[PDB]
Amino acid sequence: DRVLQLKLGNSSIVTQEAANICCAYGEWPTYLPDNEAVAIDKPTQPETSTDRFYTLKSKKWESNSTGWWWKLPDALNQIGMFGQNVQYHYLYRSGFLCHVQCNATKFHQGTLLIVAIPEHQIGKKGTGTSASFAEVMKGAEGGVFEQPYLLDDGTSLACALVYPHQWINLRTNNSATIVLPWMNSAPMDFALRHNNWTLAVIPVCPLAGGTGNTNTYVPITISIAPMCAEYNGLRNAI
Amino acid sequence: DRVLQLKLGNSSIVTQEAANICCAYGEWPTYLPDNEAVAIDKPTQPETSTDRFYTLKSKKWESNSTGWWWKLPDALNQIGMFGQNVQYHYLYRSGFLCHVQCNATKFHQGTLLIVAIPEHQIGKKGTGTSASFAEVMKGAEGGVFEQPYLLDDGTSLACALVYPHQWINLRTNNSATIVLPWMNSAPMDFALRHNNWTLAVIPVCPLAGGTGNTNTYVPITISIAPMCAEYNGLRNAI
Amino acid sequence: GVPTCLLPGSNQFLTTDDHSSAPAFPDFSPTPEMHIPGQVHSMLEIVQIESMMEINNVNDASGVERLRVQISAQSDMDQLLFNIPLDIQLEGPLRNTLLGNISRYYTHWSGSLEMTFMFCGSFMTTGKLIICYTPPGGSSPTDRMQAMLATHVVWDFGLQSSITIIIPWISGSHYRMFNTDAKAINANVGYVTCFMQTNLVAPVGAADQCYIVGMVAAKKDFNLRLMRDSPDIGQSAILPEQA
Amino acid sequence: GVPTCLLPGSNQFLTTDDHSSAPAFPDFSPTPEMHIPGQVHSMLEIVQIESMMEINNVNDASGVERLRVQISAQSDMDQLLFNIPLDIQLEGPLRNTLLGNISRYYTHWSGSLEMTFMFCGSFMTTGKLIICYTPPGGSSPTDRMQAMLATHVVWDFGLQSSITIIIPWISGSHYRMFNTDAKAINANVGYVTCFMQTNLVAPVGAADQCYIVGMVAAKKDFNLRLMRDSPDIGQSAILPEQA
Amino acid sequence: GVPTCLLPGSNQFLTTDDHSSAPAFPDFSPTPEMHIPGQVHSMLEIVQI
Amino acid sequence: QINFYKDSYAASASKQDFSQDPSKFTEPVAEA
Amino acid sequence: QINFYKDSYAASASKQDFSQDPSKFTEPVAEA
Amino acid sequence: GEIVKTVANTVESEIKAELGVIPSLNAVETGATSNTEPEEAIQTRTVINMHGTAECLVENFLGRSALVCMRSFEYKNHSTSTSSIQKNFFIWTLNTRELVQIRRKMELFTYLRFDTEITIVPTLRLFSSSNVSFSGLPNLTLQAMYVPTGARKPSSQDSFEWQSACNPSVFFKINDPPARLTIPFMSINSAYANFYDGFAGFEKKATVLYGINPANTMGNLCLRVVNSYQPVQYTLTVRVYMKPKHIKAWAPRAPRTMPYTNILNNNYAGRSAAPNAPTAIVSHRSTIKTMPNDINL
Amino acid sequence: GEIVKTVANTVESEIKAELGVIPSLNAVETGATSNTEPEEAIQTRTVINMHGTAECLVENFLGRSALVCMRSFEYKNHSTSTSSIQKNFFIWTLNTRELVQIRRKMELFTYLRFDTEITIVPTLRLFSSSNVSFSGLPNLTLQAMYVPTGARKPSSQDSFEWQSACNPSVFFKINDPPARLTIPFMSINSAYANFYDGFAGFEKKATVLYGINPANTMGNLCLRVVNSYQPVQYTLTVRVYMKPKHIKAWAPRAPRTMPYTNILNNNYAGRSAAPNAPTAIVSHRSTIKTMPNDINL
């Protein structure tokens, strides 16, 4: 249906113009099974202080915007008890529920592709030197696509629909929801040095309006909820 | 427990500060089975004139002592009816029970590693010539480690704990007991030319005391009991 | 010993062989299998996924402008809006697609395709389009009075943003060819054309200019047969450690 | 004869092959098997044995002085006494160990370790130590107020001379690497630190200076996977008959 | 054909090998066995003398 | 498949896996 | 294993011996 | 997951003018792919299709032997008036990125688990020296030694690292059929990652590169001419062909469009113009109403 | 002895503050290794571990083909104006001590019983004479003859000790795959001893050397070029690779740290400085509080 409510911990997001819930690859975040575990030390599973919606800063959708990406867990590594379980623990595992918000009038037109890319290694144009730590790790601020047409990579936006994706077409939709499971070759990872999902918001069709509805201030807001988060290797904060 | 009594033949050793009994590789000396025997001539099994504690000379534990080793059966080849069964017989087989004694006050500190090394081939430093007969065969007198840190070999003292070992830490212990089975690739051996266990006493932590308890005369005494000894090839004494 | 004769093709290396070979690490224990999402067993799972076509593959269009066809209110009627060369093998809109990229590792193909077109205008912008698939044999239609004689679907805009036209498998042969010759009977698929059915109508407050995004995918009758090196990626030297 | 084709890798010599080979001494009767103590079936039996670490691997220490860490009564409090780099692969305290030597014939490893520390002071010397294992990610602790936030065991001296701290297997990957790079996420294990918990207290008649001996071993969850030539032993010529 | 890999020690001549070999005289009928005294089966029979 | 060695990983190709679930990618939606 | 010769010692490796008794070396003590 | 050996059959359909039933319409915004059937979009006939699917299985798509490396070195006497080192060997750090066909096929998937089969194909030639008769090609014995990371490397032809007491090494000749062996799945993780959005080190500096996967510290292949130098030169070229086996692939990818410029990252410079330019992947046509291959009669 | 194919699983544990129960404490003086469990030292989770142990089995650790010998001789006419003896042969006394990797692996155990597999890898070259065209590498027939101790040795290429009527000899060519055969377990004792604390003779003199094991009087390998001398030179190098089979090992050892200086004993000179110096096996750090690889951010 279109009306949807997401209740996670304290948080509760309602939307009356939703397409559906995209479950990446048909999965639903789960806790790590005993037969898949590696770290023997007992994990901490907060279950409400982390597994909740963290709403990041909003981006302004211009008529010339290339697109934005937020890397996970990087985007949340300083936000709430999620960030403070990451800082105090060597190891991390969680899934994410990403909810993107964009409203506009029925007189506005536009289309956002909301893509969750696994292991989105950013390739850079015109240089043989790999992307620096700063240009990759931007946190809650996120990043901007120099080349949305190639996904800041040698790949293409046309074929980006392999990845878990939803659109926000302002005719039909104002919100997109993607459920991201744990996507890695390891049962855990060091959250401060490796990102496993890149949430990309890319305008395929520009925001536009008619006489009087031009140059409307249309923000784009990202809300991300960790899902089934667990941390290991308790030590001092880093 | 800590209190222990060892009664072998005439002999009887008591100790009220013992760690335990170390049985090398979990074995307990046995007589040679019929299906493992090679020499057809009937063996002599004295059982009390040999299988008894022979207490060797004591060594003074200095604050700079490198360590001592006694080679078996060499150390006992002249002591008692054991030596006179070795001299009159070509062939030899026995196990050994080695008991090391070292007392000191509760105000003294120190640590001895008592190692029983099988086939401890002594490698020598700064020369390509192999160890001479005299430098290897010292008998009841025993030998002194030039290089305890390498076990008078290219090996290491750190990894010496593979071998059957006990410590004498003067906090906890004043005596160490190791039971040595027959350790050879042959059911017998010529006792005058081959030693199968090397009992090494190595200070890892020096003997020390506080004001007034310095430079205390702390001897180290070795008592060795042949176990299940049998001899073969009766001939004249050699 | 066992009598033996060594046949032709004995000592050679065929890159497509399939035999057991000596294990270099005997008794090696590989890392335990672990559930990872999105396991792929066939490449036919991938070509079944929609992916945008570069319908606006024109010189004046740069980047994302190529993925959207631009639609306007007409002052005329029955007008052609855009076409799509169905030449997967050649440089056309369907090349830069999952269907195109993956199929181009193959030489023969068969099966129905689907094109999905999503309207990216205003909720107030209404209109009707007719998307026609013309089997091969002649010119690409320029008049709606001929295109409608072929396989077509009329598309009315509304709460459902998208329309799917199936490009049915209409071929004499069981398979077609990823041939360099577009106009060969074994290779050509036909033409997809879009015409205005009534018009695009938008009120004053909404933009007169609108975007349609086209995506193509294979259906479950799709088959790819003969494997080949893709012409899309090339190399003139061993890739170095520094560019 | 029997038709046959000779596959690639036919005539070669792979040092890890495993086949039957011609017996040079037909009908040879080897010497009968005989019970010898200490039969080893696995190398995991050996790394399970304690062995001293060269914690005092400093220039001023020679020989057995390197196997004992030196502990004194402090005039301060909360002071760091010693650390241990858990780098088996690199030149550290754990190298010259059974765990280190044997594991270094391998490239990957997994499992918990145990460090056992034995106090070699006086019966009158009392004290409490806190030994902390800090998983990787940051600097090695220098303040007990941070080290205690990690895995730790407080060690009170007494009739039991020794304490065991388990270095738990805390890794994202199933295995870690014996890599030349210490600071790689695949290789580093963390840090082991020792701090004073209260102090070392000895009466006048006993020595103010005391020795702690550290030993390390693997537990039963320990695994070693990929075999390699050990970097510890080397050769530049065929070893002659005389030096 | 039958897949095959040729191991080390394939083409060589080991004087202690033990295999069947091609018969040069096919269907040859050797002279019948005849009882001769003093048959020896082992060299341990001889050193016992 | 076929194998002439002890190790399972030395074996020939395993090409008998005809399972398909495109719904992982074509209908990854909670509500049908 | 596998063997194409009479002699048992000519056979291939025997790598199916997964027994372990570290107690020989880790607990070589008479009294538990 | 249903079993699909043969592609779907087609069912017969008749005329249809039902209300509330709009199969050709759909909602792309859900992220779902159109479920429209040929049967309900057009009138179809019954087709029993027996076309197989075996040859799109990932085991077959990826399970082909592909060149991953090609190294050459001069087989000669490298000893000079100063140094005695002999250098008729090369060391290759293993990777699937030096050659683009194999690279791009397997960047189609984020994660791959596969036991890999390596075939080594050596070729000799006689170097065109100032004056040298072509006296034939010797049957040299080569030694390919796998050196796992952390093991000491050979820095000479005569080095004693070539014992390969522990390291797996394969000896083969020029004239013999190409060397072959199977390397297992060796990642410390459950799969190889072709893309790594992170850094392989705990430190922040610039020397810790983006995209380097710690689990892909895959070791090295050292290859040597065991035969010592001949009086004359030879150029030995070794081509290494690699064949994934028992593949298991996850998370398909957007295919690479830009050329690869290196193996340490996925950076791109692109074509000067279409096709495969950064601003234009597909080649141009004059207008969206233009047929480049229109059929003219 | 329990069967261990996979390493131990980890059991779940909870908080614990019980009196009289001190698992992390223990007594090293007993000679016993700490029995402390991860479960009772920390709080653990349930881990079902499926990691194999096959690759630490002594059969696999030792059962790898390793170089034990590498001899070369000049294949030419050695006859002069005085002597007719031809000398295109070498004699090697068998031992596992000429190469350190194999030596040290198997000095990890006091006693070993193993049937051993020998692979002989010959390589030719053309000697760089004053003027010689590289006219190719001949396919010479080599003869490797095992000479047991007490049997008469060949002192020439043309000697008639090479009949090998009783002695096992293997004839192989350069171009053929390397020669291979299995030598059984041959010690007059129940196992080979890598270390012998004694003297192999009944006499006391200096000529009776320490560490020489009488049961390790293991015989000799004599290798010859069966082909008689060619008009021109060739340097034949023979590498012998040895692979223990059916190994049975006893009494593990303290691993060697010092370099080997010879094969007749285990004497050592050591490094000038750490690592592996007599006074310093592990390399140095400034203080016991110093991290050589501290992570800096």
Residue numbers in the entry:
A (entry chain B), B (entry chain B): 11 to 248
C (entry chain C), D (entry chain C): 1 to 243
E (entry chain C): 1 to 49
F (entry chain D), G (entry chain D): 28 to 59
H (entry chain A), I (entry chain A): 7 to 303
Lines quoted from the article behind this entry:
Enterovirus 70 (EV70) is a human pathogen belonging to the family Picornaviridae. EV70 is transmitted by eye secretions and causes acute hemorrhagic conjunctivitis, a serious eye disease. The capsid of EV70 is composed of the subunits VP1, VP2, VP3, and VP4. The major capsid proteins of EV70 are organized with pseudo-T=3 icosahedral symmetry, with VP1 subunits forming pentamers around 5-fold symmetry axes and VP2 and VP3 subunits forming heterohexamers at 3-fold axes of the capsid.
Cryo-electron microscopy (cryo-EM) was used to determine a three-dimensional (3D) reconstruction of the virion of EV70 to a resolution of 2.63 Å. The nonenveloped capsid of EV70 has a diameter of 30 nm. The map enabled the building of the structure of capsid proteins except for residues 1 to 6 and 304 to 306 of VP1, 1 to 10 and 249 to 250 of VP2, and 1 to 27 and 60 to 68 of VP4. The lower local resolution of the cryo-EM map and higher-temperature factors of the atoms from the amino acids forming the BC and DE loops of VP1 indicate that they are flexible. In contrast, the pocket in VP1 of EV70 does not contain a continuous density corresponding to the pocket factor. In contrast, the pocket in EV70 VP1 is not completely collapsed, but the side chain of Met224 of VP1 partially blocks its central part. Thus, the discontinuous density fragments inside the pocket may correspond to solvent molecules. Whereas the main part of the EV70 pocket is formed by 26 residues of the VP1 subunit, the end of the pocket pointing toward the virion center is capped by residues from two VP3 subunits.
